């Protein structure tokens, strides 16, 4: 609804944005033929968003965006992840291998060009109109002969939008020398740890600082000691004016994916198959893991990360199913498609109703296969660790059935066994997880649809799941270290070909691949019908109040700084403060430890020019902007285009926003720039970073 607009759509949205509080001139925010604020936005490390905040190429992004770089530069002597990092001179900024920042130099509507090229149709059902290989061939053709060589640092890309009804060509400028400049300690950068993920109120200072480096002429260059900071076309001014309830706020970033044009049948499928299976299977897996972690402190250490990784999409699916149940998402897709069908009937064009029918019939046809795919993926592929135990290759088997190739094959198998049964793997915890997961899977998947090895539960073990799992470990070469070593001393192909763990792993991966192959053909009639469906929606109501689905491209969104009521008699305001961090402090809980330097700043009220009018220290705020994954680190702007914060999350009540924007619940969770500037100053003591920024009072 309130969307993720293309840069091209700024002209037709400008009057609405000005009516809502925007004060800056249109072309100062985005101009296709000149420097604008869009030039200060980057795609950071291929997923996150970032922003240039100085004339020396300083870049701000989230702490979770720069986490890998902070961890790669951390040692037991200098633990930057735990204590933070603050380069006191430019020469101290740490280079990062395999990093990139992408500027969106130009954006061009190439729809007529692509549609003309597509007319050279050999097959009307061809999926080349969505093919990245085909679209790249069109981009190179339009850009010219050896474009990347004639314009170093530049590259061109064509993307489909609106289901193949609009195409844009992006000219990108990529920098690969991007150095670590500063980061708060993890106690600030990830304060709520996984407890506060998807949660508002939020008290996390989710930021990290980098710097773009380039050759002497500002042109992209890989890491070199001779590289100099980039002087950019444009950078953001930092506002110290803060935010008030109802203030206009806007964001630019790279949202990843949305499903705004789902039919009501696709919403039902998402709920009843995807979400219900993920919820059910992860609840079983997590329940067993938690019981084992709570009983043995060593199991808690080994399984804490695996448990946290399972919980993230579990929480997302709970949040998504809450919107489907309470916000009428299915009903609103049903009303949208019925309105298009009625309009098509009145215009004498039945192709829109035919397209919606095709989608519904494909969804109904693939239901059993999709249910079987999600059951095996959630239940076994992800659910059971020994499903990813070693499977001897075609060549490895041959190199065991008269040369030194046997010791080579055994070394490869040993390396894979040592990765599977690593320092964090408990065979006992895995057997208990497998028994509960397989019991549920065997109740849901009939005998005829089981992976072949799982048929032994009924046929060989009289339905005893525990005995079938016990037998896998008791007899397998990968059941324990002593069992592997006995095999490694006298390795026979006959033993491997009949190994219960190998047969289980092979069998479950066989079924998983077979289901994937049988389901893949159903995606194409839905995609082709969506091209017709979205064309109808656009022709009927226009490209004014319906944005194209996110597809990892540059978008803007606007709204207001505003809280919301999550439930009866409860209101969450628009801004959190440093007092809220102190309320959450728990010294004996690593997730909620408070940095001593930050605690003393709060006690002393050493907030300087960063506190609000009442003398309170702001931490984070929330806004009615429409964001999703891909918007981590996005710049949040004032009515004047000044930086007021960095987006870092969205509340669980707004996960349904990827299908239907929720005005009364969905909020972007943003770290206040005043809190960013307080941490750099009072916790990092890195004054040179403050001095190079253009700070407006």
Ligand X SMILES: CC1CCN(Cc2c[nH]c3ccccc23)CC1
Task: Return the sign of the alpha-carbon dihedral for residues 419, 96, 232, 218.
Answer: negative
User: Which tokens go with 501?
Assistant: 């763990």
DSSP for 607-637 reads -GGGS-TTS--EEEEEES----TT-TT-EEE
Token pair listed for 631: 């918007």
Smallest gap from residue 379 Cβ to a second copy (A) = 21
CB of 113 closer than 8 Å to CB of 142: yes
Q: Which of 39, 206, 274, 549 is catalytic?
A: 206
Told to check if 233 binds Cl ion by CB under 5 A, we report: yes
Cα gap 449→511, rounded to integer Å: 9
Residue for token digits 């008269």? Answer: 402
In whole angstroms, the minimum distance from the beta carbon of 165 to Cl ion comes to: 15
* Window of 298-306, 533-541, 574-582, 631-639 that interacts with a second copy by CB under 8 A: 574-582
For a second copy, which is the closer residue by CB, 130 or 582?
Answer: 582
Q: What is the distance between the alpha carbons of residues 203 and 121, in angstroms, rounded to a whole number?
A: 55
470 Cβ contact list (under 8 Å, min separation 6)? 431
- Cis-peptide, bond into residue 201, ω within 30° of zero: yes
Q: Counting contacts by CB under 6 A, is residue 648 touching ligand X?
A: yes
Q: Which candidate in 389, 507, 632, 634 is catalytic?
A: 632
Residue nearest to Cl ion (CB): 351
Strands (E), 311-409: none
To the query of whether residue 426 is one of the catalytic residues in this protein, the response is no
Q: Is 266 within 8 Å of 259 (Cβ atoms)?
A: yes
Nearer to ligand X, 65 or 515 (CB): 65
* Residue 74 structure tokens: 């951390």
Q: Which of the listed partners (ligand X, Cl ion, a second copy, none) does 349 bind, with a CB threshold of 5 to 8 Å by partner kind?
A: Cl ion
Binding residue (CB under 8 A) for a second copy from 417, 572, 652, 675 = 572
How far apart are CB 432 and a second copy at their closest, in Å? 12
| CA quadruple 606, 610, 611, 613: dihedral, nearest 10 | 130
Residue 577 touches which of a second copy, ligand X, Cl ion, none (Cβ within 5-8 Å per kind): a second copy
Q: List phi, psi (to 5°) of 467.
A: -65, -35
**Distance between CA atoms of residues 555 and 10, nearest Å:** 10
User: Is 569 one of the binding residues for a second copy (CB under 8 A)?
Assistant: yes
| Contact assessment for residue 279 and residue 655, using Cβ atoms and an 8 Å cutoff | no
Cβ-based nearer residue to a second copy, 315 or 667: 667
**Per-residue contact track with ligand X, 158 to 197, x per CB under 6 A?**
---------------------------------------x
CB of residue 619 vs ligand X: minimum separation in angstroms?
A: 14
* 3-class DSSP state of 291: helix
Smallest distance from the beta carbon of 614 to Cl ion, in angstroms?
19
Query: Measured in Å, how far apart are the chain's first and last C-alpha atoms?
Result: 35
User: Are 82 and 8 contacting, i.e. CB atoms less than 8 angstroms apart?
Assistant: no
Comparison of 356 and 655: residue with beta carbon closer to ligand X: 655
Query: Restricting to residues 193-222, which ones interact with ligand X according to CB under 6 A?
Result: 197
28 counts as catalytic: no
Which of Cl ion, a second copy, ligand X, none binds 351 (CB below 5-8 Å, type-dependent)?
Cl ion
User: How far, in Å, CA of 123 to CA of 547, rounded?
Assistant: 29
Please, are residues 504 and 471 in contact by the beta-carbon 8 Å criterion? no
State the number of CA atoms in the 13 A half-sphere of 338 facing the CB: 8
Strands in 151-281 per DSSP E: 154-161, 166-175, 177-183, 208-214, 228-229, 238-239, 248-253
Q: Which does 197 bind (CB under 5 to 8 A by kind): a second copy, ligand X, Cl ion, none?
A: ligand X
Partner whose binding site includes residue 580, from ligand X, Cl ion, a second copy, none (CB under 5 to 8 Å by kind)? a second copy
Q: Is 624 in the site for a second copy (CB under 8 A)?
A: no
Size of the site for a second copy (CB under 8 A): 20
In angstroms, the CA 646 to CA 256 distance is 17
List the single partner that 662 binds among Cl ion, a second copy, ligand X, none, CB under 5 to 8 Å by kind.
Cl ion
Task: Pick one of ligand X, a second copy, Cl ion, none as the site partner of residue 241 (Cβ within 5 to 8 A by kind).
Answer: none
Mutual orientation of helices 297-326 and 329-347 as an angle, nearest 10°? 40
Centre a 10 Å sphere on the Cβ of residue 554 and count the other Cβ atoms it contains: 23
Q: How far is the CB of 307 from a second copy (least distance, A)?
A: 17
CB of 333 to a second copy, least distance (A): 23
# binding residues, Cl ion (CB under 5 A): 7
Q: Does position 311 bind Cl ion by CB under 5 A?
A: no
Separation of CA 340 from chain center? 32
Cβ closest to a second copy, residue 5 vs residue 665: 665
Cβ proximity to ligand X, 315 vs 431, nearer residue: 315
Q: Toward ligand X, which CB reaches closer, 197 or 286?
A: 197
Judged by beta carbon distances under 5 to 8 A according to partner kind, the member of a second copy, ligand X, Cl ion, none in contact with residue 294 is a second copy
Closest by alpha carbon to 589, among 316, 201, 287, 194? 194
Residue 43 interacting partner from a second copy, ligand X, Cl ion, none (CB closer than 5 to 8 Å by kind): none
Q: Which residues, 63 to 122, sit near ligand X by CB under 6 A?
A: 64-65
- Which tokens hold the place of 498? 């009949």
Phi, psi of 257 (to 5 degrees): -145, 150
Active site residue 453: no
Q: What does residue 461 show for φ and ψ, rounded to 5 degrees?
A: -110, 15
Q: Which is nearer to ligand X, 577 or 632 (CB)?
A: 632
> Taking CB under 5 A as the criterion, which residues in 646-675 touch Cl ion?
662-664
Give how far the C-alpha of residue 240 lies from the chain's centroid of Cα atoms, to the nearest Å: 30
Single out the segment in contact with a second copy by CB under 8 A; choices: 160-168, 204-212, 224-232, 570-578. 570-578
User: How far apart are the C-alpha atoms of 130 and 326, rounded to whole Å?
Assistant: 34
Judged by beta carbon distances under 5 to 8 A according to partner kind, the member of a second copy, Cl ion, ligand X, none in contact with residue 573 is a second copy
**Residue tagged 């870092």 (tokens):** 648
Q: 573, 602, 606, 692: which one contacts a second copy (CB under 8 A)?
A: 573
Q: Is the dihedral of CA 142, 146, 151, 153 positive or negative?
A: positive
Residue 476 makes contact with a second copy by CB under 8 A: no
Of the residues 36, 45, 54, 64, only one is catalytic, namely: 64
Strands 41-44 and 238-239: unpaired
Q: Site residues for a second copy, window 199-218 (CB under 8 A)?
A: 201, 203
Residue nearest to ligand X (CB): 649
Binding mask 525-564 for a second copy (x = CB under 8 A): --------------------------------------x-
Maximum Cα interatomic distance, the chain, rounded to a whole number of Å: 82
Site for ligand X in 29-68 (CB under 6 A): 47-48, 64-65
Binders of a second copy in range 264-293 (CB under 8 A): 291
3-state secondary structure of 264: helix
Query: Which of a second copy, Cl ion, ligand X, none sits in contact with 576, Cβ below 5 to 8 A by type?
Result: a second copy
Told to check if 649 binds ligand X by CB under 6 A, we report: yes
Nearest to 244 by CA among 557, 661, 674: 674
- Closest approach of Cβ 574 to a second copy, in Å? 8
Question: Would the CA dihedral through 122, 124, 126, 131 be positive or negative?
Answer: positive
Instruction: Please give the residue ranges that form the binding site for Cl ion (CB under 5 A).
Output: 232-233, 349, 351, 662-664
The set of catalytic residues is 64, 206, 632
Q: Which stretches of the chain bind a second copy, using CB under 8 A?
A: 201, 203, 291, 294-295, 563, 567-577, 579-580, 583
Instruction: Kindly list the residues in this chain that would bind ligand X in the complex (CB under 6 A).
Output: 47-48, 64-65, 197, 632, 648-649
């Amino acid at each position: 609804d309130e969307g993720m607009w293309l840069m091209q759509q700024l002209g037709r949205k400008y009057a609405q944005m000005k009516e809502r509080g925007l004060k800056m001139k249109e072309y100062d925010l985005y101009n296709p033929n000149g420097t604008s604020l869009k030039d200060a936005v980057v795609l950071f490390d291929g997923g996150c968003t970032g922003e240039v905040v100085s004339d020396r190429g300083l870049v701000l992004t989230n702490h979770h965006c720069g986490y890998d770089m902070i961890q790669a530069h951390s040692t037991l002597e200098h633990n930057y992840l735990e204590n933070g990092f603050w380069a006191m001179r430019e020469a101290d900024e740490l280079p990062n291998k395999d990093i990139s920042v992408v500027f969106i130099d130009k954006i061009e509507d190439v729809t007529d060009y692509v549609k003309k090229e597509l007319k050279a149709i050999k097959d009307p059902n061809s999926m080349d109109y969505l093919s990245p290989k085909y679209l790249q061939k069109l981009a190179d053709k339009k850009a010219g002969k050896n474009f990347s060589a004639k314009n170093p640092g530049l590259s061109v890309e064509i993307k489909a939008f609106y289901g193949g009804n609009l195409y844009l060509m992006f000219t990108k400028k990529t920098y690969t020398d991007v150095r670590l400049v500063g980061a708060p300690p993890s106690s600030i950068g990830k304060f709520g740890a996984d407890t506060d993920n998807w949660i508002w109120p939020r008290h996390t200072g989710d930021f990290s600082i980098f710097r773009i480096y380039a050759d002497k002429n500002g042109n992209p260059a890989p890491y070199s000691e001779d590289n100099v900071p980039l002087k950019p076309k444009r950078f953001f001014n930092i506002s110290l004016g803060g935010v008030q309830e109802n203030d206009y706020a806007m964001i630019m970033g790279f949202p990843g994916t949305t499903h705004r044009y789902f039919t009501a049948s696709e919403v039902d499928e998402w709920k009843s198959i995807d979400n219900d299976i993920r919820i059910r299977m992860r609840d079983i897996r997590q329940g067993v893991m938690l019981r084992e972690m709570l009983a043995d402190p060593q199991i808690k250490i080994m399984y804490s990360a695996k448990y946290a990784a399972s919980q993230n999409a579990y929480k997302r699916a709970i949040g998504a199913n809450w919107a489907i149940k309470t916000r009428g998402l299915r009903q609103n897709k049903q009303a949208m498609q019925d309105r298009l069908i009625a309009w098509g009937a009145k215009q004498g064009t039945p192709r829109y109703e035919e397209a919606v029918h095709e989608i519904d019939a494909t969804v109904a046809k693939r239901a059993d296969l999709r249910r079987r795919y999600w059951m095996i993926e959630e239940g076994i592929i992800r659910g059971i660790e020994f499903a990813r135990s070693p499977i001897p290759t075609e060549d490895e088997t041959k190199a065991l059935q008269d040369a030194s190739a046997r010791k080579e094959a055994i070394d490869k198998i040993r390396t894979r066994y040592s990765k599977f049964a690593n320092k964090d793997y408990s065979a006992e915890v895995d057997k208990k997880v497998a028994v509960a997961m397989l019991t549920e899977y065997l109740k849901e998947i009939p005998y005829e649809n089981l992976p072949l090895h799982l048929r032994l539960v009924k046929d060989r073990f009289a339905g005893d799941v525990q005995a079938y799992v016990d037998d896998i470990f008791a007899r397998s070469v990968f059941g324990s270290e002593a069992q592997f070593d006995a095999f490694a001393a006298v390795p026979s192909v006959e033993k491997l070909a009949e190994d219960p763990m190998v047969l289980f792993a092979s069998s479950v991966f066989d079924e998983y691949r077979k289901l994937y192959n049988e389901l893949r053909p159903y995606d194409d009639p839905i995609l082709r019908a969506q091209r017709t469906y979205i064309a109808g929606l656009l022709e009927m109501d226009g490209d004014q109040d319906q944005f194209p689905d996110a597809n990892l491209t540059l978008r803007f969104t606007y709204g207001q700084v505003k809280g919301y009521s999550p439930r009866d008699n409860v209101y969450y305001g628009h801004q959190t403060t440093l007092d809220g961090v102190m309320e959450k402090e728990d010294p004996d809980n690593w997730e909620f430890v408070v940095d001593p330097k930050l605690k003393a700043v709060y006690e002393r009220k050493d907030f300087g020019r960063y506190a609000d009018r009442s003398g309170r220290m702001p931490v984070a705020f929330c806004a009615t902007t429409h964001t999703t994954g891909g918007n981590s680190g996005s710049p949040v702007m004032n009515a004047n285009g000044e930086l007021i914060g960095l987006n870092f999350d969205r509340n669980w009540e707004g996960v349904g926003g990827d299908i239907q924007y929720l005005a009364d619940y969905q909020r972007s969770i943003i770290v206040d720039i005043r809190y960013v500037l307080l941490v750099i100053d009072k916790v990092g003591g890195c004054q040179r970073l403050l001095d190079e920024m253009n700070i407006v009072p």
